[PDB]
Amino acid sequence: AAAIAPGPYRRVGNIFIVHCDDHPFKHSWEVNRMLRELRLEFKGQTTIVPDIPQVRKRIWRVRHIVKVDVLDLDEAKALIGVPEHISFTDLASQLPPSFGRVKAVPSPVIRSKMNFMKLRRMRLRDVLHRDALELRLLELKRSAMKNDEQ
Amino acid sequence: YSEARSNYDGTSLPAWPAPGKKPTYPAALSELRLPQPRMRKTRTEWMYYHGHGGCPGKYGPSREIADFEYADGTPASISGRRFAFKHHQDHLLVQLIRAAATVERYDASGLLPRIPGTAEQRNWDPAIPLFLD
Amino acid sequence: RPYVPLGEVAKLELQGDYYMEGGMFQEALEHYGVVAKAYNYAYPENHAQRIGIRIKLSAAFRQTGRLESSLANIEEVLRMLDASTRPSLELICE
Amino acid sequence: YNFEEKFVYFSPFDYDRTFALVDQCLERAETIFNEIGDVEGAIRVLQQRKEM
Amino acid sequence: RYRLFHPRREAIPMHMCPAKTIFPLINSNNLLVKTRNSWEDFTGRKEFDED
């Protein structure tokens, strides 16, 4: 109506699809480190990253090896095909935290430590399950003995 | 029997228009912003446009549709590489969702600067106006 | 065996299992109805797939609230297990 | 490094679905016994679950 | 040409892997996640039918 949108206003961000188009290893180690921060190590690899100052800095640094595409939050939501009322924050909270490489750990030794602890806690789950069963059985037997005494 | 899907839901855009109507055509020219050079799309670009990730065997029906099926309709087993590809697609979805969530959280906290670019880009590129105030 | 899109009916069964896990028991029951129809048409009598889908359908009925229907379906499942030969230990336990 | 392979663990709850089914059935039986107030039944069913 | 100008949304198509793959009940106001966490989590092939 040739006037400003008469309603509550919502801020909408952007998401960058970054595709590596040149051999990253042929450049200086700073460029390769920025690409790895963008999660790129080989030509033909594509990644999805947030539109934030740090990501913008990295893409600006490596703009001659990276081709960028933009997707507003609305466009990304339409692309994935989810209801508009659902929030990417809700989706993130729902999805598991141990999906893949949980986090970039300081060193592969620490990564091996993390995997070892994952397996150790997996085993401890069953160990504690059995131990709790034993404890409940012991409590039931103690109660039965008390009742028999009474 | 045979299968032919371009979308997960199996829906497809109307391919054949009404009789006697002028049909829609794709953009033969490349997606380059500048009017020149005026180059036609490459075969790989056409593959990207039609959905295959540049190669016949990367994405699309040739990658998502089972290559065989028992005559009585029983489907095929889940290969290790099939499960790995499904995990890769889920990983792409997770990356997208996590990036969107990070952007939303930054917006809520108030970290998204009102200025277009970073200091380096701003002092390198004249196209960004001056936001001093 | 007659041809049946067992791939599509398996998609429906997986969707029904997801509905069960999500608590949408009516939707799970609706999907299991189609899956059971397809399995009944496709597989022969007293078949492992048929008894399994009947188990799932009985569970869906019980969760929705049709306790009598669930009891009847599970009783028929037990009858089919008795009639069959070398039934799966996991299947009979479930 | 890469010593998680020396401790690789596979859960029986995942690699034997019959075991998980029976464990759940015994848990439900124990709950039913507790609700009813029975003691011997709960003790025997829990002990059998532990033995499994 | 090896200098192709196509959108990277095309480079990574999301047509056959929509959100419903991991959130099957999303369209019905139910946010249940069933995502294949890692290739490491692969119990192996399993027969669809006994026949």
Binding site: Q45, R101 | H88 | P87 | - | -
Partner: peptide
């Protein structure tokens, strides 16, 4: 090196992937 798995990775074959035949009740 360190792997990011930003690209498709084929799952490594492992003995835990053996097709386990389900236990069947005896025929007698």
């Amino acid at each position: 090196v360190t792997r990011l798995y930003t690209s498709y990775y084929t799952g490594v074959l492992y003995p835990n992937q053996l097709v386990q035949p389900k236990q069947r009740l005896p025929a007698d």
